From Swiss-Prot, chains A, B, C:
Its EC number is 2.3.2.-. Pfam families: UQ_con. This is SUMO-conjugating enzyme UBC9. Belongs to the ubiquitin-conjugating enzyme family. E2 ubiquitin-like--protein ligase mediating SUMO/Smt3 attachment to septins and PCNA. Seems to be involved in degradation of S- (CLB5) and M-phase cyclins (CLB2). The keyword RNA-binding does not apply.
From Swiss-Prot, chain D:
GO terms for biological process: cell division; mitotic spindle elongation; protein sumoylation. The keyword Cell division applies. The modification N-acetylserine is found at S1. Its EC number is 2.3.2.-. Interacts with SIZ1. Pfam families: UQ_con (PF00179). This is SUMO-conjugating enzyme UBC9. Present with 2600 molecules/cell in log phase SD medium. Keywords: Acetylation, ATP-binding, Cell cycle, Cell division, Mitosis, Nucleotide-binding, Nucleus, Transferase, Ubl conjugation pathway. Residues 3-156 form the UBC core domain. It comes from Saccharomyces cerevisiae (strain ATCC 204508 / S288c) (Baker's yeast). GO terms for molecular function: ATP binding; SUMO conjugating enzyme activity; SUMO transferase activity.
Length: 155, 155, 155, 156
């Protein structure tokens, strides 16, 4: 099983070194064992941005075909960002098997890619109508919502 | 009002030279008068495509600032197409004030632009998650849905 | 036009008598006249509740058959409350023609009824999955969201 | 052509259904989001246990109107380093030469594996690149250092 072997390697690599303020670990099953194909992680907002102070939770679901196919990465449904679907699914070219996904991509690369996305939305992939509208038409309103969401996910 | 004068012109104009199989009309108010700023229209699917035989209803909402600003065009909420948000809002650059909107654009050009979009989804507008997923990963499933939606909106 | 006669009556009535903290007015069309069948209003949260401090914006859409048929009342799409659909449509007994709508119901009655709903969600109208789930499963999380939304709509 | 586009549809299906780990290949998208069946982008992973390992080397595959009678043209980026790759990026490979081993039945998988095999095993009969061929033939240490860094350049 390449998928599970790769996920064990990812666990070992992450535990050894990962970016400051981020976390990621397999979820526990009913028996206390790890579900290597489903992880919970957290992405800190960047200092100096309206995202600062929040730690935004994601789930990473690795399909059976991983690493040939990318994991699905989701914020909570309703998370506010122009490139995040209503379901929470993150729209990012590195997570798209037809675009920039490659099997060598590490969890560290994914979580930093998502962190970078927060304060720098992509205009070729608006996935959420109200956030994209405010980001583009009413930046003051967009910024207020971002700062309130940072508070929602703050300690 | 420039807006209402233009809408009168669009109305009297549409009623003489409109694309075959399409319809468009201001909606009626409580007193049977026309709401010039809110129309109902219908877009026929092209023959030779899976959209054939349907006539897909849209509402066209003209803001007070029209024609300086574009109208908003919506299919029913839940309409299935990669470029149509959950609300029914259609993503089309000619309806975007920072891209291709120009005050001269006529309703005819708008409806034809919506028609063209049906069988050729734009990859820069990932507006509807499942429709994109199917379009990209399970084209047979995508086509089957399109075919059934054509029946939904048939005669 | 029984509808528009009733709506002109409702307007004059509102301007001479309305609860403190509330506002309501027909929207303006492109020529500066009033669209009597579409109003924008605001509902203050009541003091001593987690909704306190917010003024929550609504649209009131009166159908041609009003007052025989109730108006449709909507918060912004995405507004958080167990009885508010994703579209922002409010579920309330007095706004349902098969329930407690009566043609004699005034705008004051409607807006006070919406105000009452804010702090008392109805379990037989679970319109919003995450809001209902937090209200049932995680009161602390439910309350925090309400308090942040109050700030969002604060003065 | 018309056989050309029909064949290319089939190639896309065969590939999309089945191909070696770490390779990718897809028609490029046109301005309307539709596929250009006659120009694909692909990636060739270096073989593990060679100085090419860890790289995924990008190629373009351009199918002429007369495909599959005539072979596609396959190019690495201009300035790619390998003794059998011209300055333009064009790969010199027998199965890609109509005057040598091209046959209409050859599939994309066979092309990309042929290119992969060529990486660590240059053909002296196609010295397409002076500096690469000279280093390969006269200063192997220098050649290997360049190959290793180029693997980093295109790191998987």
């Amino acid at each position: 099983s390449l998928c599970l072997q790769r996920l064990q390697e990812e666990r070992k690599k992450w535990r050894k070194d990962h970016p400051f303020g981020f976390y990621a670990k397999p979820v526990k099953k009913a028996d206390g064992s790890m579900d290597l194909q489903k992880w919970e992680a957290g992405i800190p907002g960047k200092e100096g941005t309206n995202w600062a102070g929040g730690v935004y939770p994601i789930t990473v679901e690795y399909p059976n075909e991983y690493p040939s196919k990318p994991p699905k990465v989701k914020f909570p449904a309703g998370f506010y960002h122009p490139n995040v679907y209503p379901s929470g699914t993150i729209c990012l070219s590195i997570l798209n098997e037809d675009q920039d996904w490659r099997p060598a991509i590490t969890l560290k690369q994914i979580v930093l890619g998502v962190q970078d996305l927060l304060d720098s939305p992509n205009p070729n992939s608006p996935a959420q109508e109200p956030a994209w509208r405010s980001f583009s038409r009413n930046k003051a309103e967009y910024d207020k919502k971002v700062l309130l969401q940072a508070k929602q996910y703050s300690k």
